[PDB]
Amino acid sequence: RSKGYRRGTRYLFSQDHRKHGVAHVSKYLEKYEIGDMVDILVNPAMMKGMPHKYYHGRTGRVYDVKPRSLNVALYKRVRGKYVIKKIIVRIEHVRKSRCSEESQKRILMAAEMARDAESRGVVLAPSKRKIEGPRKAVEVSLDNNQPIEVGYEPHVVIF
Amino acid sequence: SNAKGTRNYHKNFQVKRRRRREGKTDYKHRTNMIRQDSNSCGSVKHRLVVRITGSRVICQIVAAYMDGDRVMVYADSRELERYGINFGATNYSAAYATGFLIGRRALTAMSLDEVYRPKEIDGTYSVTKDIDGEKKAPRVFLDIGLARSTRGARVFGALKGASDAGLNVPHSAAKFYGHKPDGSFDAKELHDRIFGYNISEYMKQLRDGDPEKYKTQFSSYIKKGIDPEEIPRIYKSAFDKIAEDPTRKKKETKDYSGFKKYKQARLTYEERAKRVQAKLSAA
Amino acid sequence: KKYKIKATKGLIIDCKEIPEPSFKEVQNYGIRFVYRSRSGVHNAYKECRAISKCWAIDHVLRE
Amino acid sequence: NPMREISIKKLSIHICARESGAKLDRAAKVLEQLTGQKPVTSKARMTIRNFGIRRNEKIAVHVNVSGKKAYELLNTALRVKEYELKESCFSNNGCFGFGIEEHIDLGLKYDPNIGIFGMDFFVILARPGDRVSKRKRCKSRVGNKQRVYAEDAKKWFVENFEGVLVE
RNA sequence: AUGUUGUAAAGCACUAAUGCGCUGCGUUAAACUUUGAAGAUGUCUUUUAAGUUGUUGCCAGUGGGCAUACUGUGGUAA
RNA sequence: UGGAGCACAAGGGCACAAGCCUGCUUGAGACUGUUCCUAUUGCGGGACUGUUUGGGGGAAACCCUGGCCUAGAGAUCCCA
RNA sequence: AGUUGCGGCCAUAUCCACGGAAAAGCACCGGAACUCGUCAGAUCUCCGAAGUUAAGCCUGUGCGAGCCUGGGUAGUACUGAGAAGGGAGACCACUCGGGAAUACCGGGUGCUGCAACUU
């Protein structure tokens, strides 16, 4: 209700039950590059370099790397339009985003067989996905799997 | 409070990391050690891990990745026995020779041994410079783990030997044997400790006056044929063989797979069911 | 409500409508059923006379 | 099984010259002359009026000795008690102790400038391999097959002095 | 495809409460949480469906609101 | 396993520590730029870089521009 | 097939009781002239190799406490989208959708990386 920087964060900035302690070592060995997608995710045990609570749980795109830090760009809504924001966050509140895993292994195999198709000459680009359709057909059999005879079954009470 | 033997004590317990519960890693020291710039993208840091066990001195050069460290070069104090030394590892002259052998053995793999010749063994504090026209000498940082940093410890003797070999490791002249509190440095007390001017002097002292103590303190020294006067020449003869061929002797024996006879097998599932039911029936 | 099979994940394999009898004749019938009240669910038995099984259910609802 | 012998780990002696000042240095010269090492002083954690102590001053002095030096100090103090101890002075984990009433029974001659002080003796036994819980790297826990117990410590006492267990 | 959340309900693992029997039975929570929805909210792919905007100039009125379906807070209530 | 402490309100955080003892010190240095709360906007309070004929601690990796984090804040005109 | 050095994920790995262990290792272990540090060579620092697998480390066992994963509880509680339904109200019902949680029962009890060494 007052408006200090860490306003109203009793549950948002907390550890999660037998997951206390400082950042582990593999969190310092990741390699970040310009153009990556990243998730912001605050660790409340590290005091330095952390962003404002608005950005906890948002995904952004890297445009610069410092000796201890990153610069991230992303969108914020303010009543009627969007605006670009530039956040400075330390490497301990960030992790790689898996948000493009589906789309990358699909575009990879497409160019794979494209090279394996030009090797044979016969090629074709269009490989759009399709939504799931109506339903195919069924051939249910009763040689085994006898029916079970269900119904309305009068009502009972116990106290 | 809930006390140690109760149910609520275990439901609420959080375990520490496995290398800390064993007492082998200090994790604040490890994080300050492997930190580097997110900018660099040139190559990963190299540390020189020096650990002294109950019977030997180990040296190895490591780099940190996301699923475990990797060893680039390795040297041991038990390899010194093919250069003439068998009279006592884990002493100050063995740590020096183990670090000296890993510096030469690392420069060879990079083809920088014709460059960066071995410095004179008995010089002063001489952190090495980079010669113009060719590659920088590889840079390495010292990592002593949970051993205390005291003036005159064996772990800073392995640091001194890797500098004389031609590596680029930073340090100051403290923690050596000639260092004076004012800030001066006498470079002959460190030469008298690299060679056995400490050991030979002690054997001669307690042999003349009490050979009953001399026979237990230096038992294996006598039965191996080491007499005190020739000690500072056996080391001097080993520091010139290392500087001429420091390479693995290349033996590649085959597998010890017959040792599978020594594991105790687990009861499967039904030897336990029979073991339970029989114990209830006759009860 | 007995198994946990819902309509969005189910299949209808067959649906047949039984036709009325051709010859008409009065007989006696008995109808088991449950019904919902302002405050619960109840059981009842209720005999009657009709000319078919579906005419007998129309007559019990009418009463 | 030479790795299972019991022995004296550490011996503790201390005197409580209650209020610090001049009475301390009389005691501080007793422990030095009796054993041979400079003793250590102790402070009071809180202030109490019923006893008459503040929250920062000296109350007592103590000293810890080991080796074969402590084995013969333990022999002289036991003879003052006729080589006999109450049975209820031994604890669960191989410890026992007793108090000497008057300073001048063990040794050091009168010198009426000092006075007569009381002592307090405490003894700790152990087998080899106790280092695994005191060291720095790979600190651990001892294990029950080691770990001197009460009755293991009683029968150690009737073999080195031929004592007698009262009650 | 891949992230974020601590409400309803429920519960006693922490904080604060509550009756008995001498291990069980009984009762609680806006400023309690071991759990935990329905719903919301980020990013990638039209190389998914269905459909068919960008930049800038000169300017007005308005800044006492009210009702209702569902949903809270204060109040015996309106 | 923290059931204690950590100047002060409450919340969050912390065990070879951020708590206790102890050594040395004046980074509570001089300048310069990007960004967050935060907008149509001043002041203020934080975060992160660079440049130094620059310090302190440490064998070294490494850390340090006040206080473990969220409060302790003052235009135009005039004077020193 | 394992152990040791340095690790990643951080209980299927923790805690309590008993047992096993070929070769190496890892240890415990004998000392104090030098280095270094104490009330104390207990810890820390230096120099060793007589003795021992007793402990630590590693492996087995237990209708073991915990933890991990399933079933039941249950299409229950709660709930998104609707309609001039019932009721004095408190609130209950209907149509198309989504869907939990103790008590109780079953099964599991670390997985992996780089290097050196062992018949």
Swiss-Prot record, chain A:
GO terms for cellular component: ribonucleoprotein complex; ribosome. The keyword Ribonucleoprotein applies. The keyword Membrane does not apply. InterPro entries: Ribosomal_eL21 (IPR001147), Ribosomal_eL21_CS (IPR018259), Ribosomal_eL21_sf (IPR036948), Translation_prot_SH3-like_sf (IPR008991). GO terms for biological process: translation. Keywords: Ribonucleoprotein, Ribosomal protein. GO terms for molecular function: structural constituent of ribosome. Pfam families: Ribosomal_L21e (PF01157). Belongs to the eukaryotic ribosomal protein eL21 family. This is Large ribosomal subunit protein eL21. It comes from Encephalitozoon cuniculi (strain GB-M1).
Curated annotation (Swiss-Prot), chain D:
It holds the Pfam family Ribosomal_L5. It is found in: Nucleus; Cytoplasm. One of its GO terms (biological process) is translation. The keyword Cytoplasm applies. InterPro entries: Ribosomal_uL5, Ribosomal_uL5_C, Ribosomal_uL5_CS, Ribosomal_uL5_dom_sf, Ribosomal_uL5_N. One of its GO terms (cellular component) is ribosome. It comes from the Eukaryota. One of its GO terms (molecular function) is structural constituent of ribosome. Keywords: Cytoplasm, Nucleus, Ribonucleoprotein, Ribosomal protein, RNA-binding, rRNA-binding. NCBIfam families: PRK04219.1 (NF003258). Component of the ribosome, a large ribonucleoprotein complex responsible for the synthesis of proteins in the cell. The small ribosomal subunit (SSU) binds messenger RNAs (mRNAs) and translates the encoded message by selecting cognate aminoacyl-transfer RNA (tRNA) molecules. The large subunit (LSU) contains the ribosomal catalytic site termed the peptidyl transferase center (PTC), which catalyzes the formation of peptide bonds, thereby polymerizing the amino acids delivered by tRNAs into a polypeptide chain. Belongs to the universal ribosomal protein uL5 family. Component of the large ribosomal subunit. This is Large ribosomal subunit protein uL5. The lineage of its organism: Eukaryota, Fungi, Fungi incertae sedis, Microsporidia, Unikaryonidae.
